[PDB]
């Protein structure tokens, strides 16, 4: 009667999957972005400084609307 094992395995499977599925939830709710920036390479860090400076929030994106639309020439 091998069913009785499964209740043990379901709990461990769920509990260990809570963190990654929680931060994916928390980040969206609290950053607005599912994933956080990856400071793995100098270029990634460098640009991260750039975003943090311009918008004052690295996870708020500055689309084309930040560009001055017209120049009087």
């Amino acid at each position: 009667m091998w069913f009785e094992i499964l209740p043990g395995a379901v709990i461990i499977t769920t509990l260990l999957s809570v963190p990654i599925y929680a931060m994916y939830g928390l980040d969206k709710l609290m950053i607005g972005n599912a994933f956080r920036r990856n400071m793995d390479e100098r270029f990634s860090r460098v640009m991260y400084q750039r975003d943090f400076r311009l918008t004052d929030n690295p996870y708020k994106m500055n689309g084309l609307d930040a560009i001055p639309d017209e120049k009087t020439n």
Partner: protein, 116 residues
Amino acid sequence: VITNNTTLPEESELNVQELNLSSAALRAGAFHLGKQCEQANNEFMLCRQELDDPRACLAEGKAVTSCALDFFRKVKKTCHEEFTQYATCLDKSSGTMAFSHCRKTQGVFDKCIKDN
């Protein structure tokens, strides 16, 4: 090390219209942007390597930023909706802003820019 006799350009000259455009927005237009400003970029980047004086490449640098700002005015004029979706996807799809995830939305933009 900087002394009085060392000549730095005046503040007004260094002032010039800047991009101030976030990372994900930049990475979106990278491939189409690059094909256009390559002439300025290579001219700028070539001197900077051979000659390592920032004030010497001051003139070329203004060309590079102008070309970048010139490109986005076109994008702002036509594909504004598409570019924002591509950038939004590229930003909100992974922590690295990899192109490998957003191939679909990318296609939408590439067809907009090649039709306009």
